[PDB]
Amino acid sequence: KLDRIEFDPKKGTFKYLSTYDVHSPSELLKLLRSQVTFKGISCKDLKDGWPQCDETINQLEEDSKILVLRTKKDKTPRYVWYNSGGNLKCIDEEFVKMWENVQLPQFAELPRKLQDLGLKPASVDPATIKRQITNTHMTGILKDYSHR
Amino acid sequence: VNVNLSREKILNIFENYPIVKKAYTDNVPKNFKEPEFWARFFSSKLFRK
Amino acid sequence: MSHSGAAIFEKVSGIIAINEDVSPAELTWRSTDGDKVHTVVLSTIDKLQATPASSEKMMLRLIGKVKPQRHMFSFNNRTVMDNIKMTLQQIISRYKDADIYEEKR
Amino acid sequence: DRPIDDIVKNLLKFVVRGFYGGSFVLVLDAILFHSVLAEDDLKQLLSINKTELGPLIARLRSDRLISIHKQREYPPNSKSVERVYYYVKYPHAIDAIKWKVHQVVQRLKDDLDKNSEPNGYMCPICLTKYTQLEAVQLLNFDRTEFLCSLCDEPLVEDDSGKKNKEKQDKLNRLMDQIQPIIDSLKKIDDSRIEENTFEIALARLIPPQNQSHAAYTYNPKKGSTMFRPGDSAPATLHINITTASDEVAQRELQERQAEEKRKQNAVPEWHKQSTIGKTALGREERENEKTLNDYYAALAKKQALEDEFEDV
Ligand SMILES: [Zn+2]
């Protein structure tokens, strides 16, 4: 009667049904794609019913095929998501630091600064937005046809 | 807004246009009824073209 | 962006879609997790009730022709609600025309 | 929708995946997959604690890749609480990305230009840097070695003399690596993007959860003159088929209309006849057909919930 057990009438056998029936990187990749929401699939449940998951997940991470959330105590895969973007690692650490160093100016002044440098600004200053009698025996017969 | 149609006009449309007949014979009656087809046809861009 | 959108059915958030390819056109609503699915055949709908634009509430209800069946839906954005309403207006109007012709003949 | 929206999304996806860590991709991707997303829903989508979510949201907000919107909510069953929603304002993110890309490229170019200038000098003791002009006036009487002011000690030549090529390599790599961003921006400039708003973003909403507590609705307070910073941004056709019986019926209706039409101009009876002599005013074939059909048949055989609502 339980749902986590599968019956085999051919031999009359009970099998340990798993939440997700994935035993190959191809199956996992399509399962993540089929998700209608961004709720990652738990790796705790993924490991059950599948001998190795860390090895396969690590290879996909190197290939940039999926996004993996890893613990902080030690590198261990947790809830994963399908990678809809490009290569996960494409920027050298020396340039990430430079990006961190750069500080954006005040937003109200940023569009003006870009125009000074010749770059078209895709924004506007918020300050520029502007908010934007006789015969009373006919009590109600007379309809107001004032204009035509 | 109402538009009046007659069988003689219906035959004329098929004779003067084979595309309309092509989409009529293979659809009416299989999926829905004739009156919806003509209302569907008029609202479509095919009638405008 | 004129046949799909977010809607709340029976206090359950989900996606509401209009399927016109399959005749007759039917209104299908599915929960985000897929646990609950509701399908309504538009041919059975008699009237389309919608809340006034002057009220903060944004419900849209379809009533089926005969204890008549009643289906109520709630939306999030007025533009989405209006877009669905305009499309649904065309479907209900045509099916009403077919019913008049069918009974008339 | 529009092709440009995908281009903007792709630009954001590349920027977050390259210039930010791992958890940043998860947060922004979730807010890109869905429209305005409640903070509570975002936590459970990624299953990351509030403390861990803080650094990610804060940094993304600082770079203006994500916008915030706080509105008062009044649950029918609980006391009112302020809710926070996160979405993406494409003009803001594109504006921020464009400036940062220029700054990083400009900084390397300026740094590359700086490295081409003479090295300079420094004092090992006080660690005070001296330019060539400044070091010339501090040399000793014997004019053999430069002398420090604070320390009165010989100076040491500065480094960076061999980096003339290293910085050139650094600039070469970044331009090649950052190619997709410029290409995406070039297409973005060609088109025109419409600024996003909390209400506008809700049109594309994909509910995160089944029974999310946060109400994904924008009910602005009636006729409110208050303005907050950065919270403002720039028929049926019926057809009737007329048959022969209906055609004559329409003719009868048209004939009736014509008969009534003349009446409004018809002269009255008083007007017609001079009324002086009148009083004052005031105070069987079927059988024949069957035998024919039988006879012709023989010939062929021979020859052969109460709320206000309106009806839409
Ligand atoms: Zn010194």
C105 in contact with D, Cβ within 8 Å: no
What residues sit around ligand 1, an ion, with C-beta below 5 angstroms? Answer: D 123, 125-126, 148, 150-151
**What is the b/e burial string over C20-40, where b = at least 16 CB atoms within 10 angstroms of the residue's CB?**
eeeebbbbebbbbeeeeebeb
**How far apart, in whole angstroms, are the C-alpha atoms of residue A60 and residue A68?**
9
3-class secondary-structure state, position D238: strand
Tell me whether residues B39 and D237 touch, CB distance under 8 A.
yes
For residues D85 and D61, the answer to whether their CB atoms sit within 8 Å is no
D202: buried, middle or exposed (CB in 10 Å: 19+, 13-18, 0-12)? buried
User: Which subunits sit against C, judged by 3+ Cβ pairs under 8 A?
Assistant: A, B, D
Breaks (C-N over 2.5 A) in chain A follow: 132
Report angle CA A122, A124, A127 to the nearest 5 degrees: 165
Report the Cα C88 to chain-centroid distance in Å.
6
Q: Which residues of B touch C94 (CB under 8 A)?
A: 36, 39-40
**Residue C17 contacts residue C24 (beta carbons within 8 Å):** no
Distance CA D41, CA D134 (A): 61
Distance from the A35 Cα atom to the nearest Cα atom in chain C, whole angstroms: 9
- Give which of A93, A99, A83, A36 is closest to D65, Cα–Cα: A99
Q: What is the resolution of this structure in A?
A: 3.2
Cα–Cα dist C56/C11, whole Å: 17
Chain D positions touching B5 (Cβ under 8 A) are: 239-242
Measured between CB atoms, which of C23, C24, C94 is closest to B39?
A: C94
Check D17 against A111: CB less than 8 A apart. Answer: no
Task: Tell me if chain A has a CB within 8 Å of the CB of C32.
Answer: yes
Q: Find, in chain D, the residue whose alpha carbon is nearest to that of A68.
A: D22
Q: Which residues of D touch A40 (CB under 8 A)?
A: 45-47
3-state secondary structure chain A: CCCCEEEECCCCEEEECCCCCCCCHHHHHHHHHHCCCCCCECHHHHHCCCCCCHHHHHHHHHHCCEEEEECCCCCCEEEEEECCCCCCCCCCHHHHHHHHHCCCCCCCCHHHHHHHHCCCCCCCCHHHCCCCCCCCCCCCCCCCCCCC
Min Cα separation B1/chain C (Å): 12
Instruction: Name all domains of chain C by residue range, CATH numbers in brackets.
Output: 4-105 (2.30.29.30)
Q: Which residues contact C69 (CB under 8 A, 6 or more apart)?
A: C44, C63
C34 lies within 8 A of chain A by CB: yes
Q: Are the C-beta atoms of D132 and D120 separated by less than 8 Å?
A: yes
B31 has a chain D CB within 8 A of its CB: no
Give me ligand 1 centre to Cα D160, in Å. Answer: 20
Rounded CA separation D93/D67 (Å): 9
| Least Cα separation, residue D44 to chain C (angstroms) | 14
Chain A residues within an 8 Å CB radius of C32: 36-37
Cβ–Cβ contacts within 10 Å for residue D21, how many?
13
- Chains sharing 3 or more CB pairs under 8 A with chain B: C, D
- Pairing label, strands A13-16, A66-70: unpaired
The bridge status of strand D238-241 relative to strand B2-5 is parallel
CB contact, 8 Å: A69 with chain D? yes
Residue C58 sits at the chain D interface (C-beta within 8 Å): yes
CA D187, D190, D192, D195 torsion-angle sign: positive
Q: Which residues of C touch D224 (CB under 8 A)?
A: none
Residue C43 DSSP code: G
- Asked if C54 is an interface residue toward chain B (Cβ–Cβ < 8 A), one would say no
CB D128 within 8 A of CB D136: no
**In 3D, which of D218, A47, A70 has the Cα closest to residue C6?**
D218
If residue C47 lies in a helix (H) or strand (E), which one and from where to where?
strand C45-50
Indicate the residue type of D132.
Answer: Q
Residues 76-115 of D with CB under 8 A from A: 90-92, 94-96, 98-100, 102-104, 107-108
Q: Give the CA diameter of chain D.
A: 155
Rounded to the nearest angstrom, the distance between the alpha carbon of A47 and the centre of ligand 1 is 64
Cα D167 to middle of ligand 1, angstroms: 29
Residue C1 touches partner D, C-beta closer than 8 Å: yes
